[PDB]
Amino acid sequence: MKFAEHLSAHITPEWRKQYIQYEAFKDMLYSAQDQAPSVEVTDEDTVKRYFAKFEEKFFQTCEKELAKINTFYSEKLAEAQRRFATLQNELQSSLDAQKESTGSHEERVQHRNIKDLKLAFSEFYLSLILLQNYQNLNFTGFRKILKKHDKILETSRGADWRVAHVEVAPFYTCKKINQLISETEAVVTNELEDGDRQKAMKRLRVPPLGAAQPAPAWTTFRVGLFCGIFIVLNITLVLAAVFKLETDRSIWPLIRIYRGGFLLIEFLFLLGINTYGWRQAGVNHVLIFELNPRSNLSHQHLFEIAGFLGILWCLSLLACFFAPISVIPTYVYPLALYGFMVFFLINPTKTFYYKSRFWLLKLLFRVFTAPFHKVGFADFWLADQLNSLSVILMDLEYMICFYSLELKWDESKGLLPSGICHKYTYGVRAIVQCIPAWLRFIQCLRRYRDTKRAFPHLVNAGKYSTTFFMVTFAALYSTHKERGHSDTMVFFYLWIVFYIISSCYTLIWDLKMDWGLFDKNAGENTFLREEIVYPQKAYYYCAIIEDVILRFAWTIQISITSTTLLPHSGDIIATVFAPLEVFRRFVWNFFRLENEHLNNCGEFRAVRDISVAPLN
């Protein structure tokens, strides 16, 4: 297990088909050696005529692979040649503009131009480094496979073939890449950094990338520590709940308060697994989300954060069950928990994942002001997640109402004991249901405005608009049934029609457009698409089935929450179906990102394009 794993781990995914096929050659050689077509006694033709036809096919395949590698390298080299000239031309103009001006507003745009140029040069350097690594890996693969050939068949043809063709091949000989690498860093050192090579090389240097670097031991230790503490606290919580809770005490406000924290911690834990799967399968989420290719979080850090927050959630709930303090009222523990969560998110000090938190804060500001910002992939993705995390918004609204009105502060234990805050009487609940759908609807309309293409942005707008009709008719039915009016039946039929319409119209879009399945050119992969990234095929069928089932369950949860069913039945339904929506989104993320990535392949794009701004 030396080079097959190494080659599999060190390949740039977008060019996966352009590398040498090490596994194919090995298999061919093994099969041939295994099936030695020997003959009775000794036959010259049997043992030497077979070893005069396999080698020719082997060398024909080798020539084909070498030609493919040469063509790809030449094309990428030409592209780099053109890009360097473009960047050089762009860099001349800023200098030309300033010096003349010298011998506020323009200053800030000039600073922005400097930053944009410094980012574009870094991306160019990264592309050059990737091409160099491509050359090195391909040569190593040829050498090792030819040595294995000469070992297996006990002949010296491969050693001479390597010298005759591979060492003469242009991709091995051409030396323009090193000159480009030297020129780029010289220009960055002189023109931008004012002669300081150390700062420029700190910016330009590339560490190991992809799935080729393990996280530090002190992170794995902390992940395990937090997981163990969380497990033991859960066991103790269940035992205390079974053996200490009274029959008369009402637990429903407590459940409605802690549901949101449970959902958040679960969400983070599942997102960690999503990141692990994306990293392992070869899906480049760093390029899609436009993160820094040299500094970004792994799955260990997300596991670390989820466990740390779970410990605090468990401690707060456990202190609410018991009473470790004889003077502090029992209704300040959820307040402390959520205040600490908020302060952890918005900590201004440069500690505890400050870059990640600031990136997320900027993203959240961009999402909640939808019409006035250009829409990227991250904004779409985050608004989709918020579409499934609306039970948290309901829990927050209910907590605010309960603490404002229905809570008796006079009682020593008033956190656990009417009905005003858990119904849609004033209509706030209907609005808080429709906020995230409204954000996605506005984003789709803005995208149509920018692109000026009717399909498929207006179709998304309608898909998100159906929720408004469904919720409106549910609310009308519920408010007419309780007051005893004669129009209950018409609203019932309208609600069921719009329920089925919404469920079908979201499910079809999920299966056909978001995931890109059921393609005409499926071929052997029945009901799937032509190219698939994840290894097993049972994953796709299981995902289709669970999505079909869980799309019907999700719509009923939203309809039921607005005083539809009897309060007792409704509470048990919402609590159980809430985690299943987060599970459905967790499953959806895999294939949405895979379908997005498969577009990058076939265009062979490995680095994000940066467009420097022009002051003049």
Next chain:
Amino acid sequence: MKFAEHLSAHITPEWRKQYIQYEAFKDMLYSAQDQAPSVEVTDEDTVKRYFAKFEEKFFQTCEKELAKINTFYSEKLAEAQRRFATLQNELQSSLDAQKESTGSHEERVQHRNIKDLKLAFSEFYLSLILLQNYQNLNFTGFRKILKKHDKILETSRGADWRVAHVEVAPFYTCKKINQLISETEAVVTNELEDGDRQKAMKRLRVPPLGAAQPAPAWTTFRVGLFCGIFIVLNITLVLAAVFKLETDRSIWPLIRIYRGGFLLIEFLFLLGINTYGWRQAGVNHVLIFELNPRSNLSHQHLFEIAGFLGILWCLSLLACFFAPISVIPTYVYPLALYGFMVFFLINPTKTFYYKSRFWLLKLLFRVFTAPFHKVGFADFWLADQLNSLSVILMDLEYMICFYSLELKWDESKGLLPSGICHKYTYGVRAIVQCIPAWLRFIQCLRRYRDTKRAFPHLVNAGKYSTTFFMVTFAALYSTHKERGHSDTMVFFYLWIVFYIISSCYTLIWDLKMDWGLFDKNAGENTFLREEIVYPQKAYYYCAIIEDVILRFAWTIQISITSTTLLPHSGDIIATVFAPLEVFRRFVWNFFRLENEHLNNCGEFRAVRDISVAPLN
């Protein structure tokens, strides 16, 4: 941080002095660059005269280092040349003997030989590999330091100096090592493995060694998980003990039963830190203990075992406090705990560290039959550890006596209920105190017999014999005072004299012989020895002080045990001082192994010699 750390981490402990001094050159260069002796009004001559005297000293130092490297390489090459001829001569004879014999007991006097030859060849291969790595690292160091020189002073002298001298140097040019490596594996493949190259290369191949390999993530995760569970269980145990234990209930048998398990877990946990320190500081415990240089436990596995056993200890004690089952008697939990520990040690299946457990089982068999086996370092070391772990033997003996007579089986919860047992009256306490001292005394006598050297083996024999006198006089005093006799005072004076004699005679041996401090050639390191491995010097003084204090405490614990002091006072005294003896041994291990290792340096030893067994 590229090459200084790399060179520090890949150096061979025994030959550390023989490598290039990268840190010295860097410091010299930096100092010179920093204090540039410029003049006022830019004097050209003055500065060019400074840059005509530093370089000459630099190149003189370079020549000295190159000569040292050349001499060391030549000497090691000659040694390898001689060793190969010796092994080849030994290998001819076995073959010569068998073939003639051919054309049970006889099989035994033949089977072991083959194994010994296969081990000797592996050690020879390892030595050759180490020499090759030495060459590579030294050349890389020269190249990088000369490049840094040419960078700092902005001159091209270093580039030409590297070509003129280093590339011509014999240690770089000589190619006999590769021929030796090829010949060794060819001989192993043909003569011993009967032409199967794969099996021979599996035996001969060397993975990364020393402190250059990281433990797998699934081991660190388990270490952290067990540590977290252990912490939470300890907190719960303390809370339950504070809030549930009754005043009338007697806890002393329970403490005396669980003390031994606590001590064992603490010993394993501290042993892990000892291993970590030995690995980091450069002390080669693998060569001293004669373990396999390619497969051996790290500190993570010891942490892993200690945490797993601590979880079971906590669960058993917690179940003893509570009653989670209403039919199982409360006195079977310690039985289950210790039975599981014993079964884990002696599991015959090839699972859960089978090689380590079998090695330890063979070692324990060798220790407990002292006179009939040759004494190595591992036997001495393990008997010393057992000398400090005698409270466990007392706990086992007391548990055996308590269950047999004192416990009342009929009662539902008789585990924690008068005092017929646990008395230094039977005499089954003085003997169990003196068993480990007896084992070490016998080992020292056997050593003297084998080596035929009076010093220092008979001195150790006397040092371990003093314990017999101290314990005997303590027992005589205690048995005469309780029955009211007139000879109490003479035994009191004898006991105090032998107490002070034993304490002084063990402390002096610890400080002067085991650790090798207070040496005549201390020089700058006052009260220490000339060469020291661990970085800080405060460690040695703190260790001396704590050893002086804790040697006086240890002697009183052994004397107090045999019915001297009032039972209530004695119990609190033996529980507090038991962990401190394990801490004292934990501190002692560091410097004992360091003093043993410093002998290997100066002889330049590695790859321990295997004496092949001759069938003859």
